[PDB]
Design a protein around this ligand. Structure first.
Ligand SMILES: *[C@@H]1O[C@H](CO)[C@@H](O[C@@H]2O[C@H](CO)[C@@H](O[C@@H]3O[C@H](CO[C@H]4O[C@H](CO[C@H]5O[C@H](CO)[C@@H](O)[C@H](O)[C@@H]5O[C@H]5O[C@H](CO)[C@@H](O)[C@H](O)[C@@H]5O)[C@@H](O)[C@H](O[C@H]5O[C@H](CO)[C@@H](O)[C@H](O)[C@@H]5O[C@H]5O[C@H](CO)[C@@H](O)[C@H](O)[C@@H]5O)[C@@H]4O)[C@@H](O)[C@H](O)[C@@H]3O)[C@H](O)[C@H]2NC(C)=O)[C@H](O)[C@H]1NC(C)=O
Ligand SMILES: *[C@@H]1O[C@H](CO)[C@@H](O[C@@H]2O[C@H](CO)[C@@H](O[C@@H]3O[C@H](CO[C@H]4O[C@H](CO)[C@@H](O)[C@H](O[C@H]5O[C@H](CO)[C@@H](O)[C@H](O)[C@@H]5O)[C@@H]4O)[C@@H](O)[C@H](O[C@H]4O[C@H](CO)[C@@H](O)[C@H](O)[C@@H]4O[C@H]4O[C@H](CO)[C@@H](O)[C@H](O)[C@@H]4O)[C@@H]3O)[C@H](O)[C@H]2NC(C)=O)[C@H](O)[C@H]1NC(C)=O
Ligand SMILES: *[C@@H]1O[C@H](CO)[C@@H](O[C@@H]2O[C@H](CO)[C@@H](O[C@@H]3O[C@H](CO)[C@@H](O)[C@H](O)[C@@H]3O)[C@H](O)[C@H]2NC(C)=O)[C@H](O)[C@H]1NC(C)=O
Ligand SMILES: *[C@@H]1O[C@H](CO)[C@@H](O[C@@H]2O[C@H](CO)[C@@H](O)[C@H](O)[C@H]2NC(C)=O)[C@H](O)[C@H]1NC(C)=O
Ligand code: NAG
Ligand code: NAG
Ligand code: NAG
Ligand code: NAG
Lengths: 47, 210, 232, 49
């Protein structure tokens, strides 16, 4: 679930995204919601 | 909304305005004297326009993670005013509303404690189904307002309106606080009160029906 | 020297087209940039968009649909137009010349620079308030002082004006004879748009028993004159 | 900011002039020798990966 990185759009058409995902952790039953950054070329849209 | 900063005459001032810097900034500072129009002090951070003294200095916009800062050293009496900052952040969109200004005030004489006088709503007002408490605050300096209405144990947040403090040809300022209630509410609680704090010193006076 | 004059009606009914005018002297209206800045009472200013020749004009995104701007070289003036005003538009509208700037943090080949604006010379402005309230006669109420309140004497005393519009109101005591210990705190503009003013007087606790304490309220727009006697 | 590569134009113009001179030996002294852009392919082939 990505949100475009903080930028002033003058076109800046940033490829960078800011995506939070439900990631696993050290324990099997537990999970965690962590975020990251990914360029436009690494991610595709899922309808 | 307003933020006050006390500075002794002839000493350095510290002014905070704006969010944390996410990109390279171009900060603008403005001077709004009481009643007058906002006048420009600093444009493009430390760089200033013609006719401005060097005591005003702006923090550089090259660093990231900090807030803008207008530094005034050895403040003269004329420098006291309201100061707004206009943020031009590369990461942030265009800002059309200035930041919350900082109210610089030279002490210009010793601190005075507020004189408070609380009056119950008029008996004539009960006939018109209107009840109003009046909390008068005067002979206080500086012009810092702290409204606190406590009906017995618990307070009432809504129904209160207060005006801006203004001096009346004296060091003191003029603060008047009001409260609109119903006749059945004045006889509901056992006693009301309006507390007034000033620079960390709270003064409380109560009132009870008859 | 640059002489900028801000002219406007100053009082406009709700849902009405507000129009102002900024007189300009010392320089042509077309050569320099122009901007409008309104400011609510007790709050921070607000950029209401700028205007310049060659189609250089941008608006505030919050009121972009309602705001308008225009210029004319012949008369050397700046005009502001706003349709459908409400009570939130009550502000002091300033008119100031603006200068642009170029701050570069990148290569500039890929638009890694941005333009910042700053207003150098301002004007007095005009105080514009939007309200539908008509002229209302003041209602006087007298606060009642406590009796023999303490060994310290000098009990208090005062009046109470309520629901009056518009300003100003002149408040005296005993038809000007009482001029000592007179407080007339500034009017508290209510949320409903009707001003309210109080006035208190410190009197001796001994003379509190029997004396003439009458506050007289005069209001010019309604030709109202009300006196009231205060006693414990 | 964007990732960018900066190459001096005097040197690139000078070297490019060395490559174009040699190429004429195979195709003739006076012929049009133009240089163009990538004509297609994946992101690998199209750019200087
Ligand atoms: C690949 O290539 C690209 C492209 O070549 C490279 O991109 C470059 O990357 C750099 C960093 O990676 C960037 O550096 C940053 O530069 C900026 C800008 O520096 C310039 O602009 C400054 C402001 O200029 C204005 O004010 C002047 C008066 O003070 C005035 O004379 C001037 O005309 C400008 O005014 C203009 O705007 C006014 C309105 O605002 C208007 O009224 C005016 O009429 C006018 O239109 C300017 O100060 C800078 O000049 C400094 O540096 C010059 C170097 O030639 C000096 O000659 C000059 O005296 C200044 O000195 C400063 O630096 C000196 C040491 O060098 C120091 O001694 C002195 O005290 C000063 O500090 C420049 O003109 C800067 O603000 C940032 O800090 C960065 O340094 C580049 O912008 C960017 N792009 C380019 C084209 O270079 C990329 O890096 C390459 N990558 C690789 C991997 O190779
Ligand atoms: C990519 O996406 C991720 C999310 O997936 C983004 O990560 C988020 O980034 C934002 C900031 O951009 C973070 O907000 C900040 O959170 C700080 C931590 O708050 C928590 O802990 C503090 C105590 O340590 C508690 O007080 C907080 O409790 C409160 O907040 C929650 C909501 O979060 C409310 O529900 C509660 O009622 C409380 O109010 C949290 O538990 C927080 O400290 C920080 O606050 C600063 O900024 C706010 C802005 O309104 C100010 O009001 C506040 O006073 C702080 O002000 C800072 O700046 C001023 C100068 O202007 C300084 O003077 C101050 O000292 C201070 O530095 C803010 O709320 C968010 O938490 C974070 N979330 C996650 C999951 O990571 C990435 O940023 C995003 N990145 C990109 C590139 O896009
Ligand atoms: C990270 O994982 C958590 C769960 O561990 C996600 O929270 C859940 O989000 C879903 C939607 O994707 C919520 O579903 C809701 O279901 C109701 C019907 O039951 C529907 O009406 C709503 O419209 C919605 O679809 C769910 O309630 C919610 N919370 C849980 C399961 O506790 C979270 O969204 C994940 N974050 C990501 C993937 O970024
Ligand atoms: C790439 O960057 C290097 C430096 O990292 C540049 O080398 C400089 O070249 C100039 C003369 O052109 C010298 O005056 C400098 O002293 C050199 N730098 C150092 C650290 O020695 C090089 O020219 C740059 N080339 C391009 C194409 O951008
Ligand atoms: C808030 C924001 O940045 N939205 C943009 C959206 O306008 C753009 O179409 C999309 C392209 O992938 O990236 C995101
Ligand atoms: C943001 O980009 C827009 C593009 O129109 C530009 O007009 C504006 O001045 C920029 N502002 C900032 C603060 O970068
Ligand atoms: C530089 O390139 C131009 C064509 O872009 C070419 O005409 C010119 O001759 C080149 N410079 C030299 C020294 O050959
Ligand atoms: C240049 O072209 C001429 C005429 O075609 C030819 O005679 C000669 O060998 C060529 N020289 C080179 C260096 O290619």
């Amino acid at each position: 679930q990505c949100t475009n990185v903080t930028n002033n759009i003058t076109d800046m058409r940033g490829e960078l995204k800011n995506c939070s995902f439900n990631m696993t952790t050290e324990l099997r039953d537990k999970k965690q919601k962590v975020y990251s950054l990914f360029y436009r070329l690494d991610v595709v849209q899922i309808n | 909304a307003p933020t006050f900063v006390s500075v002794a005459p002839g000493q350095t001032a510290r002014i905070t305005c704006g969010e944390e810097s996410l990109g390279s900034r171009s900060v603008i500072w403005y001077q709004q004297r009481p009643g007058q129009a906002p006048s420009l002090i600093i444009y493009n951070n430390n760089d200033r326009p013609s006719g401005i003294p060097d005591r005003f200095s702006g923090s550089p916009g090259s660093t990231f993670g900090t807030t803008a800062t207008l530094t005034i050293t050895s403040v003269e009496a004329g420098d006291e005013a309201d100061y707004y900052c206009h943020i031009w952040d590369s990461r942030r969109p265009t800002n059309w509303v200035f930041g919350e200004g900082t109210t610089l005030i030279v002490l210009s004489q010793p601190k005075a404690a507020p004189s408070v006088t609380l009056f119950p709503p008029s008996s004539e007002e009960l006939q018109a189904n209107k009840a109003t408490l009046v909390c008068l605050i005067s002979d206080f300096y500086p012009g810092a307002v702290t409204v606190a209405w406590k009906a017995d144990s618990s307070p009432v947040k809504a129904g209160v309106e207060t005006t801006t403090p203004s001096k009346q040809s004296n060091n003191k300022y003029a603060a008047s606080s009001y409260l609109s209630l119903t006749p059945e509410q004045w006889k509901s609680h056992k006693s009301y009160s309006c507390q007034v704090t000033h620079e960390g010193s709270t003064v409380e006076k109560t009132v009870a029906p008859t | 020297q640059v002489h900028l004059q801000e002219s406007g009606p100053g009082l406009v009914k709700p849902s009405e087209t507000l129009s102002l005018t900024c007189n300009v002297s010392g320089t042509l209206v077309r050569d320099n940039y122009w901007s409008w800045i309104r400011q609510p009472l007790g709050k921070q200013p607000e950029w209401i968009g700028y205007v310049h020749d060659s189609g250089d004009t941008n608006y505030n995104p919050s009121l972009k649909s309602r705001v308008h701007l225009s210029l004319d070289k012949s008369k050397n003036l700046v005009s502001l137009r706003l349709t459908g005003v409400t009570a939130a538009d009550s502000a002091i509208y300033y008119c100031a010349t603006t200068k642009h700037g170029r701050r570069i943090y990148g290569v500039v080949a890929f638009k890694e620079w941005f333009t910042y604006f700053y207003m150098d010379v301002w004007g007095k402005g005009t105080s514009v308030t939007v309200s539908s309230a008509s002229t209302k006669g003041p209602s006087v109420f007298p606060l009642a002082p406590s009796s023999k309140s303490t060994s310290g004497g000098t009990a208090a005393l005062g009046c109470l004006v309520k629901d009056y519009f518009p300003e100003p109101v002149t408040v005296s005591w005993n038809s000007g004879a009482l001029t000592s210990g007179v407080h007339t705190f500034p009017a508290v503009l209510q949320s409903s748009g009707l001003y309210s003013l109080s006035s208190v007087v410190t009197v001796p606790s001994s003379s509190l028993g029997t004396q003439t304490y009458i506050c007289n309220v005069n209001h010019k727009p309604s030709n109202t004159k009300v006196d009231k006697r205060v006693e414990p | 900011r964007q990732a960018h590569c900066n190459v001096s134009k005097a040197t690139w113009n000078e070297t490019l002039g060395k490559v174009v001179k040699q190429l004429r030996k195979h195709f003739g002294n006076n012929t049009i020798i133009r240089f163009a852009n990538s004509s297609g392919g994946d992101l690998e082939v199209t750019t200087h990966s």
